[PDB]
Paper text:
A common architecture is that consisting of branched filament networks (dendritic networks), resulting from the filament nucleation and branching activities of [name]/3 complex, a seven-subunit complex comprising two actin-related proteins (Arps: [name], Arp3) and five scaffolding proteins (ArpC1-ArpC5). Cortactin coactivates [name]/3 complex synergistically with [name]-family nucleation-promoting factors (NPFs) and stabilizes branched networks by linking [name]/3 complex to F-actin. Human cortactin is a 550 amino acid protein, comprising N-terminal acidic (NTA, residues 1-76), six and a half 37-amino acid cortactin repeats (CRs, residues 80-324), and C-terminal Src homology 3 (SH3, residues 492-550) domains. The NTA (referred to here as Cort1-76) and CRs bind [name]/3 complex and F-actin, respectively.
The cryo-EM structure of Cort1-76 bound to [name]/3 complex was determined at 2.89 Å resolution. Cortactin residues D20-V29 bind to a site on subunit Arp3 of [name]/3 complex that coincides with one of the binding sites of the A domain of [name]-family NPFs, but with opposite polypeptide directionality. Cortactin binds at the interface between subdomains 3 and 4 of Arp3. The binding site consists of a hydrophobic pocket, which hosts the side chain of cortactin residue W22, surrounded by positively charged amino acids (R230, K240, K244, K251, K254, R275, R329, R333, R334, R337) that create a favorable electrostatic environment for interactions with negatively charged amino acids of cortactin (D20, D21, E23, D25, D27). This site also binds the A domain of NPFs (NPF-binding site 2)6,31 and the A domain of the inhibitor Arpin41, and thus constitutes a hot spot for interactions of different [name]/3 complex regulators. Curiously, however, cortactin binds this site with opposite polarity compared to NPFs and Arpin. Second, the A domain of cortactin can be better aligned with those of NPFs and Arpin when inverted (middle). Therefore, cortactin interacts with [name]/3 complex through an inverted A domain. The structure of Cort1-76-bound [name]/3 complex displays the inactive conformation. The results suggest that cortactin contributes to [name]/3 complex coactivation with NPFs in two ways, by helping recruit the complex to F-actin and by stabilizing the short-pitch (active) conformation, which are both byproducts of cortactin’s core function in branch stabilization.
Numbering used by the authors:
A (entry chain D): 1 to 285
B (entry chain B): 5 to 39, 67 to 388
C (entry chain G): 8 to 151
D (entry chain F): 2 to 168
E (entry chain H): 20 to 29
F (entry chain E): 2 to 175
G (entry chain C): 2 to 293, 318 to 369
H (entry chain A): 3 to 39, 53 to 418
Write the structure that this text describes.
Amino acid sequence: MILLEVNNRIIEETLALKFENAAAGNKPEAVEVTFADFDGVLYHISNPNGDKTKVMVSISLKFYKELQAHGADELLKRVYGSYLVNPESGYNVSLLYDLENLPASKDSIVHQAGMLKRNCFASVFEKYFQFQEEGKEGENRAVIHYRDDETMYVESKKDRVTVVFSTVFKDDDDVVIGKVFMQEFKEGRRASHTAPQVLFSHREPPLELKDTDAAVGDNIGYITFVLFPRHTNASARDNTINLIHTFRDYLHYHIKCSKAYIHTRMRAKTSDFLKVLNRARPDAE
Amino acid sequence: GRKVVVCDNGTGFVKCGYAGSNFPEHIFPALVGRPMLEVNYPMENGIVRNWDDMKHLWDYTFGPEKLNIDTRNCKILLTEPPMNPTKNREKIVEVMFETYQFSGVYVAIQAVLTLYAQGLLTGVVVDSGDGVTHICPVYEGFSLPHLTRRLDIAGRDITRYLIKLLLLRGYAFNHSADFETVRMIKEKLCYVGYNIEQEQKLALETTVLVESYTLPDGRIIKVGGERFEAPEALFQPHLINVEGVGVAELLFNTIQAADIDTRSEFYKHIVLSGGSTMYPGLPSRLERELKQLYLERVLKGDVEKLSKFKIRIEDPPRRKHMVFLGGAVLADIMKDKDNFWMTRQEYQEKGVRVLEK
Amino acid sequence: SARFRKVDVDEYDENKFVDEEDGGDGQAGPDEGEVDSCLRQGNMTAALQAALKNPPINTKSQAVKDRAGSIVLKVLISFKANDIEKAVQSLDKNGVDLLMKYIYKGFESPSDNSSAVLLQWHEKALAAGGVGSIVRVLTARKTV
Amino acid sequence: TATLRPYLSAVRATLQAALCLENFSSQVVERHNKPEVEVRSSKELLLQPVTISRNEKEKVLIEGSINSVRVSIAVKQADEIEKILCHKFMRFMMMRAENFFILRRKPVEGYDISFLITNFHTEQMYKHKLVDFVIHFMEEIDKEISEMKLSVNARARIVAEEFLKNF
Amino acid sequence: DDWETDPDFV
Amino acid sequence: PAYHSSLMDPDTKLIGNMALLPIRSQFKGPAPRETKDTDIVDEAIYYFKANVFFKNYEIKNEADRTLIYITLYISECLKKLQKCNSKSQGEKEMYTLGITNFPIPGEPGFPLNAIYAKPANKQEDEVMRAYLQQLRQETGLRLCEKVFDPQNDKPSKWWTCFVKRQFMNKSLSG
Amino acid sequence: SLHQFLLEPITCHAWNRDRTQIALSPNNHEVHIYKKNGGQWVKAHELKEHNGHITGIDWAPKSDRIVTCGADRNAYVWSQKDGVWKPTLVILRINRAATFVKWSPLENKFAVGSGARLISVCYFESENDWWVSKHIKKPIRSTVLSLDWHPNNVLLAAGSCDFKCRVFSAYIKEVDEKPASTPWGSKMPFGQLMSEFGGSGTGGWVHGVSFSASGSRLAWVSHDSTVSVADASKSVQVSTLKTEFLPLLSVSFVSENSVVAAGHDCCPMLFNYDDRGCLTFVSKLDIPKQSIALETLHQNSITQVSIYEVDKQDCRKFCTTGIDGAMTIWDFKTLESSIQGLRI
Amino acid sequence: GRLPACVVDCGTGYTKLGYAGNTEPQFIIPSCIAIKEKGVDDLDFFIGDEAIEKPTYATKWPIRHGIVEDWDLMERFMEQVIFKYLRAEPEDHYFLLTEPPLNTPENREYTAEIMFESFNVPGLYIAVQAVLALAASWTSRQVGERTLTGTVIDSGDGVTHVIPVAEGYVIGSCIKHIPIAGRDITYFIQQLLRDREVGIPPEQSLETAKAVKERYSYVCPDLVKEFNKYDTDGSKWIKQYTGINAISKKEFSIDVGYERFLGPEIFFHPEFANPDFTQPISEVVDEVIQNCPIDVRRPLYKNIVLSGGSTMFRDFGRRLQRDLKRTVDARLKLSEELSGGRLKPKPIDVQVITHHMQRYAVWFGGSMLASTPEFYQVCHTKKDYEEIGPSICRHNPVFGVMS
Ligand SMILES: Nc1ncnc2c1ncn2[C@@H]1O[C@H](COP(=O)(O)OP(=O)(O)OP(=O)(O)O)[C@@H](O)[C@H]1O
Ligand SMILES: Nc1ncnc2c1ncn2[C@@H]1O[C@H](COP(=O)(O)OP(=O)(O)OP(=O)(O)O)[C@@H](O)[C@H]1O
Ligand SMILES: [Mg+2]
Ligand SMILES: [Mg+2]
């Protein structure tokens, strides 16, 4: 695969198996599974208070206080409705499904439950896209610490929306490979002019983030997406959010795939070298 | 004069023959199996644990199958391990004077037989076998029991350390099951390194120490830096959790505790014996460590007098039958001299340690 | 704890190999003014013949060796790309071996296109002196 | 080529001169057989180390002995991506230094790769084949580094166009 | 000893 | 492992190195009659579906060679009872198969010649041939009532799945 | 005329008197004796007593005895008293490995060059029926690589890794008689340095020495691609030729003026020593035929050159062995006809 | 940290992947990769259930008998295990991987190079599967019976291993291999259904032999009594299997008869299917325990642990225990009869332990091991990989007794 998926596979598989066994009419089985996703979030699928007819899906994020200030609760009430309940202990957003009360088309609720982290993330994008569409300029930027040392800055202007990722590469080989990938990201204008404008800054913040206490280091990159009203309005808003909330994981995934392909080529050249060296023996002729 | 018989009461093998023999006439392992035979070794570190099995082995040597000699018409020279207790020394003499009644009995220490096989009479013998390591100074053909030192490191501990080192390389070895295989690996591949920093740099930067060994189940393992690290427990005992000093420092301590006039004879006549002294590079390492100790603790720093210190450690290339060759040489030069050999007249009339040998 | 294995006692040996040099200087290095006079007149072959005379093979100081190497490298850098072969073929076998020693000394100090002409000098000296001159470079006890 | 062929010719001639080895037991240690260019225990058994340089950054260093020879190669690294690809290639091949029988686990300081060839490798392999292998190595390392750089650039182009396509 | 059998399926 | 006969007593005749056991055959032969309801043919039919999969067999008693021969003839019978329609056609085919001449112990082409020994003379050879013919005829007669069904005109597929499986990779015909 | 014995290297070889059996060591701790069953070689005998790598084999013809020295600091004398060869241990009293061994011309002594900076001259004592060694150690500073005996059974040449070729006197009064006067000197006690050469600045390790037929000339090859001849009659003068080839590992004086050497160039070469004191290269003896892998018979370095014919008084064939595992026999009458202008 | 570790167990047939602290694996996928047979074209591949039948793709199996054959396919398999199924950022999660028995240290160094130099994991533990099966057997017994000494019968989709483990360490010289597992059983069931039944399509014949084996198979005490049960009352025992055709969809019904008990019979009679091997499994276990040292044999007899998917038959442990008891009492009776010296040796208790998590026993042992707080004191971190090198993953320290 090239593009990363948005839906979590474990939630979709577990809820599809549970809803198929509920639609078949068999007895429900217990579930207690805790797992994780990208950007250090936690998921817990369980049975609340031991009742096997109820399935509770809970997500814990370390940065839910920043998302809660930008209207996450209204979007989670809008996109889920009656399934949204009070949160579990130690978890931020909880969802409840009752196996006796299920719709006929169970694909849509499974597909919405697989997009739980996306629906948590989408509220700041919806708020600032509505700020840009209504012309409400001069608002404060949104700072989301989606990781421990990585940051996200969302700003709305008169004719553009600016999304800045501040990302940290672990090793210097990843710094050089990421500079190659971002240099090809800067010259992305060959695929027409409808693409968003991508800017890259190595080791230094951009000039708009100068009053802020941004991080300066040898392993820190700043990536700016400039989004136009063709990527902002409601005809293509959700696709823009789906593409833009997974970009850091996309970039690090392709850096690691590049290093694995380099390992494949070095394995082939090492095998050729060992064949040339083993042809030099008089015993093997 | 007659024929003077000789037999070696070793832990591993029994070799018997006559006086003046250049080679041992009858060599056989000490296997005594009871019925598909339950073999029990009667010798543990030179100390007898099963005297009836040793008596049956002595009947096998004295029987018609191997030697076919009269028990009361021959002179016999036996072997004794160093630091032997006096109760076993009385017991073997009482067994050989009561149960067989030999006319000539002379039990000898193996250190003076090792020095007699090289034609020497004064020197230090370092004997490392399977159980323990002895250092024995012998002056004018007589051993010195107040200067004999004991170090509890031998080939069993080196084999156990090699098992522990090969477990850290990722090979599944068991201590109670794969002992003989790693013992064969130790006998085939291990050696004593000269300079340990140089050897560790060579093992870490190059691949010239890597050797392949084929296991009995067909797997091929690669032994690299463990070839010199396993015999380094002889010089650094804290690698195998033994509170000691090492073999070279013990040798320096037991030579420097002797008389002032006898140090130069001891320093030029150091003889290695035993199966655990057959590692390649051991006398060069011993000479280097003794010269370092003589620089540090005698000359106190200056190197101008280091060239006057002469040390020659000579290991014989014929090390397989050294003790029996020394016993054959001693029985050959004392073939007619029956005053040294104890007789039955002292045995009937209150044999006190065979009249003090 | 030990404090005695950190002394190399092989340095203080009575049977260690000493080089046993005879001494002298070998008339130091070549003359600077003579080879500059040969260079200013255009006689590159005579400058090569003068620059290879009296090497500092017996001197202990590194300064005369570096001066002689700089003189021979200044002669060899100032050569053309066509008259190398006739300059090499004018020398005898000892001159070819000393030229090979100076080429392998001048390989250690690159400066722009110095190595790009030292490779051509190495090719011509290998063609006129064989593989044994490199072995005499490798087995020289006293080096330039 | 411009200046690659005389450089490889000089390296081939020096490798023919230096790979003349024989079996030699140790003088200082009893019954040891060590490569004398590594232990450095006797100064009489060492040859003079020689250097062959193409430019200021690209050179080999050949240091021989009675029974061994160390050949240290520094490769051409034009920029940062070729530098990290060269370092990854040297780590990859030195991790497999028991399959290459003539390779060191660590380089000497200031050089990228280093071969150690003993007299046993000259006994069980033809020595002119070993010289041809070292020259073949010095060509194919640069060819594989250039191909890996081109592959990384093409992959980055396709990844950037694929992400900006879907907007 | 024997333990009979169950004529069913999992 | 494999299954052996338990119908051996010391009051039994021994022909060759095989055994001459009593059977309840209506056909004539040198074997005596048996008052008991269990015989060597019934035991071999009871043990055939387990013993046909085995490729190593150890001779424990003298009736085991008789069990091996009846098992081999059962494997020969199922190779010819595959291509039939009714029970009476199968009885005619098994009577045709029982009248044929198979290789005796001693002739080439007969398997397990290392285990089976030669007959002593001509009369013991005739007694052994008549005993094997009576065993073959009662083997076919006993198998014809168990291959087919009360829902007739169909041989059962639970017996016709053992056609291509041979005892110890050996066959009487070849 | 090349025969491929093994794929493993041959460290050393030794012929008997009839040139019918050859003793090899195929790079391990064993000696293989091959005899020629008609027109092909078969492995007759196998001798195994060393527990280390065998570095030298010599065969005394008239007494018909095989001496072997190895890296286990040991030497054995093998005698064929019955159909099986029997070894006898020699006490060398060395602490380093033995590198070379050679019999005396009268076959009463043999000389072992070792890495302990000694030369062990061993002679047989019948009082206790074993071999006693005496050491020559005073000017030698490194490992002795090659040895060669003088025809008068007293003097001994030795090349070593301290870049010197020396001539010693190995006169043992228990076995030998009084030596006559030689141009190398008059006073010959045991272990006395008669002469020493090798001072040329760029010293190389002397890999091979050889005395002449008369014994008044001595040739040696060195690791700096040099071949030198010292003449004792002409005021002990040394003439050195610097070759443009790879270094030579073995040398042999074929006649009084011709010397054949071979080495890492995988090809035997012929040098001429004139009476005026001039050493000139004549020709390579492995010129490939043209009819229009390496272009030599040996694919690896030639390590040993010996005389297959009736030695230095009249030589017609010589035998070369090397690391490629093959033995080559070269004939002078074919090489003087294939190569034009060659008269030796 | 707060994030649980990732436990991946790559087998020859099935890869079990999930997060630590869970009872069941999150994904049990087939261990195959479908590839396309310059550019981004090495990312055009599928793994698992999407890699079985694709029209333009070729299916490769990188793991044969536990040993990884192709390392590029294994690296791409780990790429889509991490980034598509687990969805874990690999720089934040510790990893527990498994290795086959008698694995070379070079394979551990290759796995460590793949894990550290391509995915940049903070830590990596490579675990022996027999110790994990012994750890997973602890959730059936009491708290005083939790030891690390026992015999592991690992039977999957390859060679069945009999592994003796003494005090958490594997006695490598007494491991034996039986060439019978689930592929041989489904091949035998496929041959029986080919000989008897009709109507099975030839492109689904391996599939319907699988579902007969996983749903209808058991073991039997006696073959002759079972054949008499199936022949006399042949309506209670003979079942029906209904399947759907892949092309031209039609329900076909077959009679599942004799192959229910003849399926798992080839463990105890290996000459039914395998020509070369004829030694039954109880003789192999008896030979393995008799080749062990004498001071450990009775703990090995007292604790025999079944693991793997091919040990998931009804009463398999009961018949293994009965056959091992009747072959271990024969030696005691022979010693009492041939000697007769009134020695009277102590009777040996043979106990085969069957537990609930027997199918994914290796994954459950890894999940219970990686959930402990001591697991971060036994891993090899990336700092130790950069300092020392890849030689730290040659040795992995055995975990102590905990829970
Ligand atoms: N070539 C060898 N190199 C190293 N160790 C060896 C070699 N041969 C044997 N050993 C070891 O030496 C020991 C045997 O020594 P030795 O033959 O002297 O035994 P021993 O006489 O029975 O000993 P002891 O008298 O101390 O009981 C064993 O540990 C064996 O593994
Ligand atoms: N009742 C059953 N339930 C599940 N699987 C079964 C059952 N009976 C047989 N099997 C077989 O078990 C096999 C699964 O074994 P397993 O997954 O342990 O193999 P593996 O990949 O070799 O694993 P490993 O070597 O890690 O133990 C499949 O071939 C499946 O057909
Ligand atoms: Mg002993
Ligand atoms: Mg498996």
